[PDB]
Each structure stands twice: as structure tokens, then as C-alpha cells.
């Protein structure tokens, strides 16, 4: 009778879903887990989510929905009022391709499990592990800047003049440049669009720094 | 006609190749040699700034990249057997399973990452491969748990019809052979993978049956 999300303040995947829920006007409650303190591995949570996935979304009766892109499409197909994809198939594919530059090629390389594995498996200090994270960000940001700057499809937003899944993924990476201290001077098109997206109430309300567990700044 | 810049070993190219065959879409594949640095030539960076495969040209217009986006494009613009169910919960489940591979697992073992680990940290190949192995095992454990215990699984990942979930699953499964990952602990994954492999459209698209393979 109300959507329930299990999330985390910092998670880019949780942020994407949170934005979509807000943009579409879907009432929900979010439960915040500490992913650094191993809440995702606790048996009581595992009782409702065996593989421990965050974010996890419960939409009334049914098993939970996981994986941020799959969830975004689920919301698109079940709540159609404010569409977050265009209608034309090539435009949809481009928007999804841009989203996946982030959600497939970039973000999975900097999740907490990877950060901890690099340190624990190789004995790398945090300072050296972060070289992997920074490289992921920079590689992704370079691709997005080139594509957004040179391709005809870009408008006010990543694809045309309507917010799409591409923008939700883009802003989720952009906020990470703040959280993880990546220089963004070289990506002015990414900046312009990210600020355009961040100016929206639905996006700002969902910002990691406005969630429980966040640091001050 | 459809034209794909591909590679024999690429899991992402394999996903797309399977869909083309299943849906009765003819294609030309250009096989890049990624050991030889074909992905890094200007011509190709022009096509894909990411320096990666696959890239798909569908007539005129710009190339399409990202295997999941391409799979949905093929679903939406072509006829041929559906590779997603009709009901949104089922579609979301299929996509989620696909994304365990395509988001959480596969991006950790692509060539650019293997090369970065060796070059940036000076890791020997054998030590770099621990990162690759950990990715496979992590994804395989997640898939085994989900597929074995969730009600949605049938003959295939989602119900009894092949979907995007299976194309991604088998793209991981074939890598267990190529990269030498033990699979004894994932019997449900094995069952479904061999079910999918039995389909001639999938068997034709197998990495080891592509030009450039050993
Ligand atoms: Cl999952």
C-alpha cells in the first residue's frame, strides 16, 4: 500500500531510484542501511532480501525489485505519467547508452565491494586503491563529455530537452565527483547538464547529502 | 543491413550476436583484434570513444553502443521472438538478473580494467587475474542464490522463455571456460546455461566459434 525502498545515503544506485520516485510523484518510504558497517550482510535484512542487494524496492505484493536500471524501467512501465524516456526508439537507445556509460562501464568499478577488495586482496593502501576509483570516474567523464558535446541528440538535457534515465545516471556520477574529490574542470558540458538536473526539486530532495547518515559537506 | 564491430572473446558482443540470430536479423561483423590495439585507432574511437566493442550500425545514423541498450533497441525496432516477457514485474526480474552480469560483474573483467591493474599497480598477470576471478565468483554466487531460490525461475532465468537474463547469463558462463573458473558450486546456473547453449542460434554465436578464436 506504499512503496518501500531499502537504500543508503551515499549509493549512486539508490540516488537514481530516489530521483525517479520523486520525479514521478510516487509516495515511498526509505530505510537507510550502513553499507560500510556491514548492514547488507545482516541475517534479518537477508530474510527479506537473500542476496543482500541495495537498493531494493518493494512495490506492494511481490518479491523485491533490484538493480537500478531495471527498477527505472519498472517505474517507467508501471507509472507512465511523467516519462523518463523518449518515445522514439533511436533516441531511447541513445539515452540508455549514455546511462550505461555510467551504470555499466563506470559505477561498478567504484562500489564499496571493489574498494575493499583492492585493499584487502592486494594490500594496497586507501591512497593507492583510490587511483582505480579516480581512473573509473575520469574515463567515464571523458566519454560523457565527448559524446554529449559532439552528438546531435544532446539538448538542455543528455537526450533532447526532457529529463531521461541518462540524466539520472549522469547526476549520480556528478555528485560522486564531489563526494570522492574528482576534478571536473575538463567536463563543461557534463557540468552544464548536471547543474540543470540538480536545479530540479525532485533531484535536489534526493541528493545524498540530504539523506540520513550523510556528512555535513 | 546491420553491421557490428565486434570481437571473438567479447561477452558484450556475444550478447548482441545471440539476439541477432534468435530474432532472424542478418548482420555483418567486423572482428577487431584487441590484443593488436584495433580499438585504439582513430577511425574506431570516432565510432566508439570508449575504445570498446560492440558498436552497432543500423542503416544510416550514428552507431549504437552498450549491449543492454542495443538489446532493447533490437527488441523495439525489429520483429522476431520476444526476449522480454509482457508483464512489468517479470520484465524487471529478467532485467535485474541480466544486470547482475552486465552491471555488477562483467565490467570488472573487461580488457581495459585488466590492463589498468597491470600497468597502474605493476601487478603480474597472475595477480591481476585474482580480480577477474573474484568478479566471476561473486556474480556466479549471486546468480546461483537467486536462480535456485526465487519463484520466477523456470526452464530459463525468467519463467520458461529465453530472455535478456539468459543472454547475459550464458555470456558469463562461456567466460568460465575461457578464463578457467570452477563452476561446481553453481548447479542451477549450469542447468540453465546448458539449456540456453542447446539453442542453435546461441551455439552459432559462441565466442569459440567466431573468426579470430583459437
Ligand atoms: Cl540482485
GROMACS .gro file of C-alpha atoms and ligand atoms in nm:
model
  432
    1UNK     CA    1   0.000   0.000   0.000
    2UNK     CA    2   0.311   0.227  -0.016
    3UNK     CA    3   0.642   0.169  -0.198
    4UNK     CA    4   0.928   0.080   0.035
    5UNK     CA    5   1.293   0.121  -0.056
    6UNK     CA    6   1.598  -0.010   0.126
    7UNK     CA    7   1.873   0.239   0.049
    8UNK     CA    8   2.184   0.418   0.169
    9UNK     CA    9   2.281   0.785   0.175
   10UNK     CA   10   2.588   0.754  -0.048
   11UNK     CA   11   2.480   0.488  -0.303
   12UNK     CA   12   2.455   0.620  -0.659
   13UNK     CA   13   2.219   0.335  -0.748
   14UNK     CA   14   1.984   0.433  -0.460
   15UNK     CA   15   2.008   0.800  -0.570
   16UNK     CA   16   1.893   0.716  -0.925
   17UNK     CA   17   1.587   0.533  -0.800
   18UNK     CA   18   1.514   0.803  -0.544
   19UNK     CA   19   1.516   1.069  -0.817
   20UNK     CA   20   1.274   0.864  -1.034
   21UNK     CA   21   1.033   0.810  -0.746
   22UNK     CA   22   1.035   1.186  -0.678
   23UNK     CA   23   1.001   1.291  -1.042
   24UNK     CA   24   0.708   1.058  -1.091
   25UNK     CA   25   0.536   1.166  -0.766
   26UNK     CA   26   0.541   0.817  -0.619
   27UNK     CA   27   0.497   0.809  -0.242
   28UNK     CA   28   0.754   0.594  -0.070
   29UNK     CA   29   0.949   0.535   0.245
   30UNK     CA   30   1.317   0.463   0.252
   31UNK     CA   31   1.506   0.261   0.510
   32UNK     CA   32   1.873   0.356   0.530
   33UNK     CA   33   2.141   0.089   0.569
   34UNK     CA   34   2.505   0.136   0.670
   35UNK     CA   35   2.693  -0.035   0.386
   36UNK     CA   36   3.034   0.035   0.546
   37UNK     CA   37   2.929  -0.131   0.876
   38UNK     CA   38   2.801  -0.449   0.703
   39UNK     CA   39   2.422  -0.395   0.738
   40UNK     CA   40   2.374  -0.551   0.394
   41UNK     CA   41   2.512  -0.880   0.538
   42UNK     CA   42   2.285  -0.896   0.848
   43UNK     CA   43   2.052  -1.201   0.866
   44UNK     CA   44   1.734  -1.007   0.948
   45UNK     CA   45   1.767  -0.798   0.629
   46UNK     CA   46   1.873  -1.109   0.433
   47UNK     CA   47   1.542  -1.265   0.545
   48UNK     CA   48   1.359  -1.031   0.303
   49UNK     CA   49   1.650  -0.991   0.058
   50UNK     CA   50   1.860  -1.313   0.035
   51UNK     CA   51   2.136  -1.175  -0.188
   52UNK     CA   52   2.158  -0.850   0.015
   53UNK     CA   53   2.107  -0.609  -0.275
   54UNK     CA   54   2.089  -0.229  -0.213
   55UNK     CA   55   1.882  -0.059  -0.342
   56UNK     CA   56   1.589  -0.300  -0.307
   57UNK     CA   57   1.234  -0.182  -0.382
   58UNK     CA   58   0.909  -0.339  -0.258
   59UNK     CA   59   0.605  -0.241  -0.461
   60UNK     CA   60   0.310  -0.378  -0.267
   61UNK     CA   61   0.276  -0.752  -0.301
   62UNK     CA   62   0.563  -0.932  -0.474
   63UNK     CA   63   0.931  -1.006  -0.443
   64UNK     CA   64   1.160  -0.704  -0.416
   65UNK     CA   65   1.292  -0.535  -0.728
   66UNK     CA   66   1.669  -0.486  -0.754
   67UNK     CA   67   1.924  -0.330  -0.991
   68UNK     CA   68   1.883   0.041  -1.051
   69UNK     CA   69   1.837   0.037  -1.431
   70UNK     CA   70   1.583  -0.248  -1.409
   71UNK     CA   71   1.397  -0.053  -1.139
   72UNK     CA   72   1.394   0.266  -1.351
   73UNK     CA   73   1.233   0.073  -1.638
   74UNK     CA   74   0.987  -0.090  -1.394
   75UNK     CA   75   0.878   0.256  -1.281
   76UNK     CA   76   0.855   0.366  -1.643
   77UNK     CA   77   0.626   0.074  -1.731
   78UNK     CA   78   0.405   0.085  -1.416
   79UNK     CA   79   0.379   0.467  -1.362
   80UNK     CA   80   0.359   0.637  -1.702
   81UNK     CA   81   0.254   0.997  -1.607
   82UNK     CA   82   0.599   1.161  -1.616
   83UNK     CA   83   0.802   0.963  -1.870
   84UNK     CA   84   1.178   0.944  -1.816
   85UNK     CA   85   1.246   0.801  -2.162
   86UNK     CA   86   1.162   0.950  -2.501
   87UNK     CA   87   0.925   0.768  -2.740
   88UNK     CA   88   1.139   0.728  -3.049
   89UNK     CA   89   1.349   0.408  -3.040
   90UNK     CA   90   1.684   0.552  -3.156
   91UNK     CA   91   1.651   0.836  -2.902
   92UNK     CA   92   1.568   0.579  -2.629
   93UNK     CA   93   1.870   0.370  -2.723
   94UNK     CA   94   2.098   0.675  -2.711
   95UNK     CA   95   1.962   0.778  -2.370
   96UNK     CA   96   2.010   0.426  -2.239
   97UNK     CA   97   2.360   0.407  -2.392
   98UNK     CA   98   2.461   0.727  -2.208
   99UNK     CA   99   2.303   0.593  -1.888
  100UNK     CA  100   2.502   0.273  -1.926
  101UNK     CA  101   2.833   0.451  -1.978
  102UNK     CA  102   2.776   0.533  -1.611
  103UNK     CA  103   2.576   0.239  -1.481
  104UNK     CA  104   2.771  -0.037  -1.658
  105UNK     CA  105   3.115   0.094  -1.751
  106UNK     CA  106   3.190   0.335  -1.467
  107UNK     CA  107   2.996   0.299  -1.143
  108UNK     CA  108   3.052  -0.077  -1.085
  109UNK     CA  109   3.427  -0.005  -1.070
  110UNK     CA  110   3.397   0.219  -0.761
  111UNK     CA  111   3.138   0.048  -0.540
  112UNK     CA  112   3.241  -0.030  -0.180
  113UNK     CA  113   3.298  -0.401  -0.252
  114UNK     CA  114   3.565  -0.315  -0.511
  115UNK     CA  115   3.731  -0.054  -0.288
  116UNK     CA  116   3.761  -0.305  -0.006
  117UNK     CA  117   3.878  -0.587  -0.233
  118UNK     CA  118   4.165  -0.381  -0.378
  119UNK     CA  119   4.288  -0.305  -0.024
  120UNK     CA  120   4.232  -0.648   0.127
  121UNK     CA  121   4.336  -0.861  -0.169
  122UNK     CA  122   4.645  -0.669  -0.278
  123UNK     CA  123   4.741  -0.489   0.047
  124UNK     CA  124   4.703  -0.158  -0.131
  125UNK     CA  125   4.659   0.142   0.098
  126UNK     CA  126   4.345   0.351   0.054
  127UNK     CA  127   4.551   0.618  -0.125
  128UNK     CA  128   4.654   0.375  -0.399
  129UNK     CA  129   4.315   0.200  -0.420
  130UNK     CA  130   4.167   0.541  -0.497
  131UNK     CA  131   4.371   0.554  -0.817
  132UNK     CA  132   4.138   0.281  -0.950
  133UNK     CA  133   3.830   0.482  -0.847
  134UNK     CA  134   3.965   0.802  -0.994
  135UNK     CA  135   4.053   0.633  -1.319
  136UNK     CA  136   3.698   0.495  -1.345
  137UNK     CA  137   3.549   0.842  -1.291
  138UNK     CA  138   3.781   1.015  -1.530
  139UNK     CA  139   3.740   0.756  -1.804
  140UNK     CA  140   3.362   0.782  -1.774
  141UNK     CA  141   3.358   1.160  -1.754
  142UNK     CA  142   3.580   1.188  -2.064
  143UNK     CA  143   3.346   0.961  -2.262
  144UNK     CA  144   3.037   1.152  -2.150
  145UNK     CA  145   3.193   1.492  -2.224
  146UNK     CA  146   3.291   1.385  -2.575
  147UNK     CA  147   2.956   1.226  -2.650
  148UNK     CA  148   2.739   1.497  -2.505
  149UNK     CA  149   2.947   1.775  -2.668
  150UNK     CA  150   2.967   1.630  -3.017
  151UNK     CA  151   2.648   1.428  -3.073
  152UNK     CA  152   2.339   1.587  -3.225
  153UNK     CA  153   2.097   1.434  -2.971
  154UNK     CA  154   2.205   1.644  -2.670
  155UNK     CA  155   1.983   1.940  -2.580
  156UNK     CA  156   1.907   2.103  -2.249
  157UNK     CA  157   1.948   1.750  -2.108
  158UNK     CA  158   2.151   1.444  -2.218
  159UNK     CA  159   1.887   1.346  -2.473
  160UNK     CA  160   1.690   1.640  -2.611
  161UNK     CA  161   1.507   1.878  -2.377
  162UNK     CA  162   1.344   1.622  -2.146
  163UNK     CA  163   1.497   1.455  -1.845
  164UNK     CA  164   1.572   1.088  -1.902
  165UNK     CA  165   1.744   0.789  -1.745
  166UNK     CA  166   2.067   0.928  -1.891
  167UNK     CA  167   2.039   1.238  -1.668
  168UNK     CA  168   1.958   1.036  -1.356
  169UNK     CA  169   2.272   0.830  -1.415
  170UNK     CA  170   2.475   1.142  -1.508
  171UNK     CA  171   2.382   1.331  -1.191
  172UNK     CA  172   2.454   1.021  -0.981
  173UNK     CA  173   2.813   1.023  -1.119
  174UNK     CA  174   2.837   1.404  -1.085
  175UNK     CA  175   2.754   1.402  -0.714
  176UNK     CA  176   3.024   1.138  -0.676
  177UNK     CA  177   3.284   1.383  -0.813
  178UNK     CA  178   3.201   1.594  -0.506
  179UNK     CA  179   3.195   1.303  -0.261
  180UNK     CA  180   3.518   1.148  -0.390
  181UNK     CA  181   3.706   1.464  -0.492
  182UNK     CA  182   3.740   1.435  -0.869
  183UNK     CA  183   3.834   1.749  -1.063
  184UNK     CA  184   3.566   1.834  -1.318
  185UNK     CA  185   3.710   2.139  -1.498
  186UNK     CA  186   3.763   1.934  -1.815
  187UNK     CA  187   3.391   1.842  -1.849
  188UNK     CA  188   3.196   2.164  -1.908
  189UNK     CA  189   2.907   2.003  -2.097
  190UNK     CA  190   2.867   1.744  -1.820
  191UNK     CA  191   2.871   2.033  -1.571
  192UNK     CA  192   2.605   2.233  -1.758
  193UNK     CA  193   2.365   1.941  -1.779
  194UNK     CA  194   2.434   1.823  -1.423
  195UNK     CA  195   2.352   2.169  -1.286
  196UNK     CA  196   2.038   2.182  -1.499
  197UNK     CA  197   1.932   1.846  -1.346
  198UNK     CA  198   2.032   1.948  -0.992
  199UNK     CA  199   1.814   2.262  -1.015
  200UNK     CA  200   1.504   2.034  -1.003
  201UNK     CA  201   1.333   1.988  -0.667
  202UNK     CA  202   1.283   1.615  -0.730
  203UNK     CA  203   1.657   1.569  -0.782
  204UNK     CA  204   1.779   1.802  -0.507
  205UNK     CA  205   1.550   1.641  -0.247
  206UNK     CA  206   1.706   1.304  -0.337
  207UNK     CA  207   2.068   1.427  -0.310
  208UNK     CA  208   2.297   1.202  -0.098
  209UNK     CA  209   2.391   1.493   0.128
  210UNK     CA  210   2.025   1.546   0.221
  211UNK     CA  211   1.978   1.185   0.339
  212UNK     CA  212   2.023   1.034   0.689
  213UNK     CA  213   2.386   0.934   0.759
  214UNK     CA  214   2.538   1.198   0.535
  215UNK     CA  215   2.829   1.415   0.646
  216UNK     CA  216   2.782   1.790   0.672
  217UNK     CA  217   2.954   1.879   0.345
  218UNK     CA  218   2.161  -0.444  -4.304
  219UNK     CA  219   2.307  -0.443  -3.952
  220UNK     CA  220   2.682  -0.403  -3.902
  221UNK     CA  221   2.854  -0.476  -3.574
  222UNK     CA  222   3.211  -0.400  -3.477
  223UNK     CA  223   3.287  -0.699  -3.261
  224UNK     CA  224   3.546  -0.940  -3.128
  225UNK     CA  225   3.551  -1.315  -3.077
  226UNK     CA  226   3.600  -1.316  -2.699
  227UNK     CA  227   3.381  -1.016  -2.605
  228UNK     CA  228   3.089  -1.111  -2.378
  229UNK     CA  229   2.904  -0.792  -2.472
  230UNK     CA  230   2.939  -0.871  -2.845
  231UNK     CA  231   2.823  -1.228  -2.774
  232UNK     CA  232   2.503  -1.098  -2.610
  233UNK     CA  233   2.416  -0.894  -2.918
  234UNK     CA  234   2.517  -1.173  -3.159
  235UNK     CA  235   2.279  -1.414  -2.985
  236UNK     CA  236   1.989  -1.169  -3.016
  237UNK     CA  237   2.057  -1.109  -3.387
  238UNK     CA  238   2.049  -1.484  -3.454
  239UNK     CA  239   1.745  -1.551  -3.235
  240UNK     CA  240   1.544  -1.276  -3.398
  241UNK     CA  241   1.642  -1.359  -3.758
  242UNK     CA  242   1.838  -1.038  -3.815
  243UNK     CA  243   2.120  -1.063  -4.066
  244UNK     CA  244   2.445  -0.892  -3.976
  245UNK     CA  245   2.800  -0.827  -4.083
  246UNK     CA  246   3.052  -0.848  -3.800
  247UNK     CA  247   3.389  -0.673  -3.818
  248UNK     CA  248   3.623  -0.854  -3.582
  249UNK     CA  249   3.865  -0.624  -3.404
  250UNK     CA  250   4.192  -0.756  -3.264
  251UNK     CA  251   4.203  -0.605  -2.918
  252UNK     CA  252   4.547  -0.754  -2.843
  253UNK     CA  253   4.670  -0.567  -3.153
  254UNK     CA  254   4.512  -0.237  -3.040
  255UNK     CA  255   4.248  -0.202  -3.318
  256UNK     CA  256   4.007  -0.049  -3.064
  257UNK     CA  257   4.260   0.235  -3.011
  258UNK     CA  258   4.289   0.350  -3.376
  259UNK     CA  259   4.131   0.691  -3.454
  260UNK     CA  260   3.874   0.551  -3.703
  261UNK     CA  261   3.726   0.334  -3.430
  262UNK     CA  262   3.749   0.592  -3.144
  263UNK     CA  263   3.547   0.805  -3.388
  264UNK     CA  264   3.290   0.525  -3.385
  265UNK     CA  265   3.323   0.443  -3.015
  266UNK     CA  266   3.516   0.699  -2.799
  267UNK     CA  267   3.519   0.430  -2.526
  268UNK     CA  268   3.754   0.214  -2.737
  269UNK     CA  269   3.530  -0.088  -2.696
  270UNK     CA  270   3.313  -0.340  -2.863
  271UNK     CA  271   3.040  -0.377  -2.958
  272UNK     CA  272   2.928  -0.090  -3.175
  273UNK     CA  273   2.625  -0.146  -3.397
  274UNK     CA  274   2.525   0.041  -3.713
  275UNK     CA  275   2.164   0.006  -3.818
  276UNK     CA  276   2.148   0.168  -4.159
  277UNK     CA  277   2.232   0.538  -4.156
  278UNK     CA  278   2.267   0.738  -3.837
  279UNK     CA  279   2.510   0.714  -3.550
  280UNK     CA  280   2.638   0.384  -3.409
  281UNK     CA  281   2.475   0.231  -3.102
  282UNK     CA  282   2.687   0.119  -2.808
  283UNK     CA  283   2.624  -0.056  -2.476
  284UNK     CA  284   2.498  -0.413  -2.506
  285UNK     CA  285   2.187  -0.370  -2.288
  286UNK     CA  286   2.078  -0.056  -2.479
  287UNK     CA  287   2.138  -0.241  -2.808
  288UNK     CA  288   1.934  -0.543  -2.694
  289UNK     CA  289   1.641  -0.315  -2.610
  290UNK     CA  290   1.684  -0.134  -2.943
  291UNK     CA  291   1.661  -0.463  -3.130
  292UNK     CA  292   1.357  -0.555  -2.924
  293UNK     CA  293   1.189  -0.226  -3.008
  294UNK     CA  294   1.269  -0.186  -3.379
  295UNK     CA  295   1.262  -0.540  -3.514
  296UNK     CA  296   1.020  -0.831  -3.524
  297UNK     CA  297   1.131  -1.180  -3.420
  298UNK     CA  298   1.091  -1.377  -3.099
  299UNK     CA  299   1.044  -1.161  -2.786
  300UNK     CA  300   1.338  -1.164  -2.549
  301UNK     CA  301   1.141  -0.996  -2.269
  302UNK     CA  302   0.810  -1.100  -2.116
  303UNK     CA  303   0.497  -0.888  -2.125
  304UNK     CA  304   0.433  -0.823  -1.753
  305UNK     CA  305   0.639  -0.545  -1.583
  306UNK     CA  306   0.739  -0.740  -1.268
  307UNK     CA  307   0.863  -1.028  -1.484
  308UNK     CA  308   1.048  -0.788  -1.714
  309UNK     CA  309   1.212  -0.617  -1.415
  310UNK     CA  310   1.318  -0.952  -1.273
  311UNK     CA  311   1.468  -1.062  -1.607
  312UNK     CA  312   1.648  -0.726  -1.638
  313UNK     CA  313   1.774  -0.743  -1.280
  314UNK     CA  314   1.924  -1.087  -1.344
  315UNK     CA  315   2.077  -0.962  -1.669
  316UNK     CA  316   2.224  -0.666  -1.480
  317UNK     CA  317   2.384  -0.883  -1.209
  318UNK     CA  318   2.608  -0.980  -1.502
  319UNK     CA  319   2.608  -0.673  -1.723
  320UNK     CA  320   2.640  -0.414  -1.444
  321UNK     CA  321   2.788  -0.580  -1.139
  322UNK     CA  322   3.018  -0.848  -1.281
  323UNK     CA  323   3.127  -0.810  -1.646
  324UNK     CA  324   3.259  -0.450  -1.622
  325UNK     CA  325   3.516  -0.568  -1.368
  326UNK     CA  326   3.694  -0.803  -1.611
  327UNK     CA  327   3.693  -0.620  -1.945
  328UNK     CA  328   4.037  -0.573  -2.111
  329UNK     CA  329   4.075  -0.205  -2.018
  330UNK     CA  330   4.046  -0.298  -1.647
  331UNK     CA  331   4.284  -0.593  -1.676
  332UNK     CA  332   4.535  -0.363  -1.845
  333UNK     CA  333   4.488  -0.087  -1.588
  334UNK     CA  334   4.551  -0.320  -1.297
  335UNK     CA  335   4.874  -0.446  -1.455
  336UNK     CA  336   5.006  -0.111  -1.574
  337UNK     CA  337   4.896   0.115  -1.287
  338UNK     CA  338   4.988  -0.110  -0.997
  339UNK     CA  339   5.258  -0.320  -1.169
  340UNK     CA  340   5.064  -0.636  -1.089
  341UNK     CA  341   5.177  -0.952  -1.268
  342UNK     CA  342   4.912  -1.111  -1.492
  343UNK     CA  343   4.851  -1.389  -1.244
  344UNK     CA  344   4.784  -1.141  -0.967
  345UNK     CA  345   4.564  -0.918  -1.186
  346UNK     CA  346   4.358  -1.233  -1.258
  347UNK     CA  347   4.260  -1.261  -0.893
  348UNK     CA  348   4.040  -0.952  -0.956
  349UNK     CA  349   3.886  -1.123  -1.259
  350UNK     CA  350   3.827  -1.446  -1.067
  351UNK     CA  351   3.672  -1.265  -0.773
  352UNK     CA  352   3.431  -1.089  -1.010
  353UNK     CA  353   3.319  -1.417  -1.171
  354UNK     CA  354   3.273  -1.597  -0.840
  355UNK     CA  355   3.086  -1.303  -0.684
  356UNK     CA  356   2.842  -1.290  -0.978
  357UNK     CA  357   2.805  -1.668  -1.002
  358UNK     CA  358   2.723  -1.696  -0.630
  359UNK     CA  359   2.460  -1.420  -0.660
  360UNK     CA  360   2.310  -1.584  -0.967
  361UNK     CA  361   2.306  -1.932  -0.809
  362UNK     CA  362   2.130  -1.800  -0.495
  363UNK     CA  363   1.870  -1.604  -0.693
  364UNK     CA  364   1.802  -1.864  -0.960
  365UNK     CA  365   1.786  -2.159  -0.717
  366UNK     CA  366   1.554  -1.997  -0.463
  367UNK     CA  367   1.332  -1.746  -0.643
  368UNK     CA  368   0.989  -1.849  -0.770
  369UNK     CA  369   1.032  -1.667  -1.102
  370UNK     CA  370   1.292  -1.909  -1.238
  371UNK     CA  371   1.160  -2.189  -1.464
  372UNK     CA  372   1.335  -2.368  -1.750
  373UNK     CA  373   1.516  -2.038  -1.810
  374UNK     CA  374   1.615  -1.744  -1.588
  375UNK     CA  375   1.265  -1.594  -1.604
  376UNK     CA  376   0.988  -1.846  -1.648
  377UNK     CA  377   1.009  -2.080  -1.945
  378UNK     CA  378   1.100  -1.834  -2.219
  379UNK     CA  379   1.451  -1.719  -2.311
  380UNK     CA  380   1.513  -1.354  -2.223
  381UNK     CA  381   1.784  -1.095  -2.183
  382UNK     CA  382   1.867  -1.260  -1.849
  383UNK     CA  383   1.977  -1.579  -2.032
  384UNK     CA  384   2.181  -1.394  -2.293
  385UNK     CA  385   2.374  -1.226  -2.012
  386UNK     CA  386   2.396  -1.549  -1.805
  387UNK     CA  387   2.543  -1.750  -2.092
  388UNK     CA  388   2.783  -1.464  -2.176
  389UNK     CA  389   2.924  -1.508  -1.823
  390UNK     CA  390   2.908  -1.889  -1.839
  391UNK     CA  391   3.126  -1.913  -2.151
  392UNK     CA  392   3.384  -1.697  -1.978
  393UNK     CA  393   3.418  -1.957  -1.702
  394UNK     CA  394   3.564  -2.189  -1.967
  395UNK     CA  395   3.779  -1.921  -2.129
  396UNK     CA  396   3.922  -1.789  -1.801
  397UNK     CA  397   3.925  -2.121  -1.614
  398UNK     CA  398   3.672  -2.062  -1.335
  399UNK     CA  399   3.543  -2.368  -1.148
  400UNK     CA  400   3.164  -2.395  -1.166
  401UNK     CA  401   3.084  -2.695  -0.943
  402UNK     CA  402   2.918  -2.469  -0.684
  403UNK     CA  403   2.662  -2.327  -0.934
  404UNK     CA  404   2.442  -2.619  -1.048
  405UNK     CA  405   2.131  -2.409  -1.130
  406UNK     CA  406   2.344  -2.171  -1.336
  407UNK     CA  407   2.490  -2.476  -1.515
  408UNK     CA  408   2.144  -2.624  -1.584
  409UNK     CA  409   2.013  -2.305  -1.737
  410UNK     CA  410   2.334  -2.231  -1.924
  411UNK     CA  411   2.329  -2.569  -2.095
  412UNK     CA  412   1.959  -2.524  -2.172
  413UNK     CA  413   2.043  -2.193  -2.343
  414UNK     CA  414   2.351  -2.333  -2.518
  415UNK     CA  415   2.141  -2.611  -2.669
  416UNK     CA  416   1.960  -2.348  -2.879
  417UNK     CA  417   2.124  -2.345  -3.223
  418UNK     CA  418   2.101  -1.965  -3.253
  419UNK     CA  419   2.308  -1.940  -2.932
  420UNK     CA  420   2.552  -2.216  -3.029
  421UNK     CA  421   2.625  -2.039  -3.359
  422UNK     CA  422   2.711  -1.716  -3.174
  423UNK     CA  423   2.952  -1.884  -2.926
  424UNK     CA  424   3.279  -1.692  -2.885
  425UNK     CA  425   3.490  -2.003  -2.957
  426UNK     CA  426   3.309  -2.044  -3.291
  427UNK     CA  427   3.391  -1.694  -3.409
  428UNK     CA  428   3.663  -1.591  -3.655
  429UNK     CA  429   3.970  -1.493  -3.453
  430UNK     CA  430   3.910  -1.753  -3.184
  431UNK     CA  431   4.195  -2.003  -3.107
  432LIG    CL1  432   2.024  -0.852  -0.750
   0.00000   0.00000   0.00000
